[PDB]
Structure 1
Amino acid sequence: MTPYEDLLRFVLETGTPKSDRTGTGTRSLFGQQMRYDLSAGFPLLTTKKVHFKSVAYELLWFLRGDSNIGWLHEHGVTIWDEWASDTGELGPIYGVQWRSWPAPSGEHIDQISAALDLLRTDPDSRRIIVSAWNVGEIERMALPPCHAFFQFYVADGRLSCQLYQRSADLFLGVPFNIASYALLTHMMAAQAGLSVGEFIWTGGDCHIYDNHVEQVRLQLSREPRPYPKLLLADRDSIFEYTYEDIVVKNYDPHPAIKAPVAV
């Protein structure tokens, strides 16, 4: 069961050559989807060693409502370096919108807490939504949100999550995005008293950068292994999880594959 590798393969073989903002060049398809059953295992890719430490801290950083890379650096995470100001600022990106979307009245909306409240008290709501796409603040962001809009759903005590990702760096970004949202779904489920269901990833521009092609072919030559299991320590609040609360059990990946990020 390898939704990611299958999509990666499909784009590599059928994607159209496309120019891009970074001036790197891509092969690209539009409107592709992946589904993972989280109850079957944690979707941390096994066909290459994914630096889950960076995934976990990045998500914790989002949950803090932070947009300065300082806290990431203190924890040894450098994935946001290339877009940050000299003072470490990224503008009001993901975390700021998730935790403190500025409402016209001057109040700040905590969408994460609001979503959790709905999961607990109105699980059948069709409005359990979090958006990072704050149209009036996009221009202030170092990069507009890639993982932009997501929704939760509950069936028979099982929590599902669907993400709309407008732009998908398939080799570097997407493995992080999948693991990040899977982890978030486990967190939200834990806090809402639910089990985990499906993660559905829906992409806009799904692309392989032209300087990632050798890395992709290498990865696609490897046989998938069983997924690890995620174990999350007890906390009374999603905002109280720490890195140490997050345990990935039996992660047995093939070797890491290095590739340069498009800036």
Structure 2
Amino acid sequence: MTPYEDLLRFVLETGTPKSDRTGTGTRSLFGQQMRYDLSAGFPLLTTKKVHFKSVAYELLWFLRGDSNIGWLHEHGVTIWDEWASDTGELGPIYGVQWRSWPAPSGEHIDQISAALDLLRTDPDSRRIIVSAWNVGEIERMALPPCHAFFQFYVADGRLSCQLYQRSADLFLGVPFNIASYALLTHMMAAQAGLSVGEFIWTGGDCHIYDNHVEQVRLQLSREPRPYPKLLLADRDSIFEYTYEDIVVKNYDPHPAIKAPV
């Protein structure tokens, strides 16, 4: 099962050429979908070595509800550095919205706690939603959210998660996004007393940048290997997980493929 490589190949082969905000140029398709059965393995890609350390810390960073790169920086993760101000600020991005979405009333809404609370007390709910798409605050963000909106689902004790990603840099960002949300689903499941089901990735603008074509063709020439296995130490709260509470067992990827400068 290689949902990601399948999609990458599909877009490489049938994507429409298309200009963009960065001026780099892309090939693109709209409304494409991936499904991983998380009970079958953790979807950290094996066709190139993915820097999980940065994935994990970025997610922990989101869960803290930080808007400033400082903490990410202290753990050696520089993926957000370009976009920060000189004081480190990114604006009310992902984590700020996840943890403290400002309602007109002056209350800040912790969507992550709310979601977990629903998984525990009313798992059949069709409203277990977290949205980072705060129409009123987009303009103050350094970048509008790419992974914008996500929903949980429970069936026979198993937790599934679907993410709507409006904009999908397939080579660079997407491998991070998949691992991030699979990790999140594990954490949420652990905290809710559920086992993991499916992760469904639904994308809007799914693109390959014109300057990643060689890197992509190389990746598609590689034979996929067994997915690794995710383990988590026990914690009282999702907000108490640390990097050290996470282990990825039997991760055996093909070599890393550097992003073009």
TM-score normalised to the size of structure 2?
0.99
Quote the Cα distance in structure 2 between the aligned partners of 1:13 and 1:86: 41
Deviation at residue 257 of structure 1 after TM alignment? 0.1
SS at structure 1 position matched to 2:82:
helix
Quote the Cα distance in structure 2 between the aligned partners of 1:164 and 1:255: 29
How many equivalent pairs are there?
261
Deviation at residue 165 of structure 1 after TM alignment? 0.2
Cα deviation, 1:137-190, whole Å, max 9, x if unaligned, reads 000000000000000000000000000000000000000000000000000000
Quote the Cα distance in structure 2 between the aligned partners of 1:250 and 1:208: 29
Which 4+ stretches in 1 moved above 3 angstroms? Answer: none
Deviation at residue 67 of structure 1 after TM alignment? 1.2
Quote the Cα distance in structure 1 between the aligned partners of 2:223 and 2:251: 15
Quote the Cα distance in structure 2 between the aligned partners of 1:27 and 1:208: 5
TM-score normalised to the size of structure 1?
0.99
| 1:167 equivalent in structure 2 | 167
Quote the Cα distance in structure 1 between the aligned partners of 2:66 and 2:47: 32
| 1:91 equivalent in structure 2 | 91
Quote the Cα distance in structure 2 between the aligned partners of 1:216 and 1:94: 28
SS at structure 2 position matched to 1:201:
strand
Quote the Cα distance in structure 2 between the aligned partners of 1:67 and 1:250: 34
Query: Mind listing any 5+ residue stretches in structure 2 that lack a counterpart?
Result: none
SS at structure 2 position matched to 1:81:
coil
Quote the Cα distance in structure 1 between the aligned partners of 2:123 and 2:73: 37
Deviation at residue 42 of structure 1 after TM alignment? 0.1
SS at structure 2 position matched to 1:198:
strand
SS at structure 1 position matched to 2:205:
strand
Deviation at residue 127 of structure 1 after TM alignment? 0.2
Cα deviation, 1:46-92, whole Å, max 9, x if unaligned, reads 00000000000000000000011110110000000111111111000
SS at structure 1 position matched to 2:178:
helix
- TM alignment of 1:101-250, pairs within 5 A: 101-250=101-250
Q: Percent identity?
A: 100
Cα deviation, 1:7-56, whole Å, max 9, x if unaligned, reads 00000000010000011000000000000000000000000000000000
Quote the Cα distance in structure 2 between the aligned partners of 1:233 and 1:78: 26
Cα deviation, 1:215-243, whole Å, max 9, x if unaligned, reads 00000000000000000000000000000
